[PDB]
Design a protein around this nucleic acid. Sequence first.
DNA 1: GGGGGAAGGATTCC
DNA 2: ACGGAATCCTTCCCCC
Length: 341
Amino acid sequence: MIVLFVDFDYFYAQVEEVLNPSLKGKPVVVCVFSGRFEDSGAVATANYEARKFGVKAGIPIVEAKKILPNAVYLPMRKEVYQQVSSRIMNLLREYSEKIEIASIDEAYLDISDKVRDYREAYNLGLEIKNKILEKEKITVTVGISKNKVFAKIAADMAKPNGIKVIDDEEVKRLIRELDIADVPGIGNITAEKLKKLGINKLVDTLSIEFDKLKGMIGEAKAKYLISLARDEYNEPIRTRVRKSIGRIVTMKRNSRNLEEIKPYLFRAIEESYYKLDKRIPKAIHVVAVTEDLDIVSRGRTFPHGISKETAYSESVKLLQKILEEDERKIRRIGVRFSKFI
DNA sequence: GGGGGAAGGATTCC
DNA sequence: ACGGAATCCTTCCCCC
Ligand SMILES: Nc1ccn([C@H]2CC[C@@H](COP(=O)(O)OP(=O)(O)OP(=O)(O)O)O2)c(=O)n1
Ligand SMILES: [Ca+2]
Ligand SMILES: [Ca+2]
Ligand SMILES: [Ca+2]
Ligand SMILES: [Ca+2]
């Protein structure tokens, strides 16, 4: 089995540089403004020009401007990136319809069939890395190896606009040297917790007692890692479908006033149905970020699809439910629809 | 003891 | 106490 991973480089930002080529070479920073007050928001993604000066995804738009006050700060236009993504996906979709669109800018391509060998598989990378650059002028890094997890690791190592192959030997070198913190799906929180238990390499997960792990990071997350250190991972490249769609918005001011919130909540839903588009959801989650940034949410699953009229109706109840089991004032409020029909 | 699921909390950027 | 979209995942639950 041979898996080929593709990752669009600084995607949201690069897309913008493609829509306005006057930025290429300039620090471009795609942001998300909450409108709570000018420059209130966070950085979604930056290009390498911004990044090399300390501007990364997640920091407040304010602190980002203190570093690079003269960079091009642009608002998020997910929709645009979405269509661009689709096109690139269908583009890839023609090298193995046994692909997995992991995210708006990640995709795992099973090239087991289409080509056997680490030489011809690599040359399928440029055959693809060149076409995407040609057909849509987008630079995409390629990762290639035995399973999704290492192909993914390969790309993170070669970026941007690069390519790398992690054969069966390297996989072995990494499991003993790769920083646990660099493993796909291991966030800051999970990495830290691993420092404690005494883990810093994928291999260390073999010393500790499964039971200890299972308690600090969970069975699943636990099995995942052990599985990796054993080169005994292998998980198929499968279709995968967005399993939820939603919208959370920051209210102009905080509150605990049901009637002051409604409009935002009702805007979240209406704006969530547009993005649903025909798909029918049977589960709804009214979500609310607290005054202290804690995500509290209450949902409900029905034995049928949820008509929008019903969303309005139920979204309120769930909201009234929240206010009951909490104290904090609500800052951001939104909805989430799932369990599609 | 454990299936099948809903619900709520937590974490990754998938 | 500066944003947002999703998913992961650990517990509660009805009941065989
Ligand atoms: N705090 C964060 C961190 C990340 N993201 C988004 C940014 C786009 C998406 C994927 O990010 P990466 O995989 O890190 O890629 P990138 O940042 O878009 O750029 P590159 O692929 O070149 O690393 O996650 C976000 O919204 N909020
Ligand atoms: Ca990317
Ligand atoms: Ca990515
Ligand atoms: Ca990490
Ligand atoms: Ca990443």
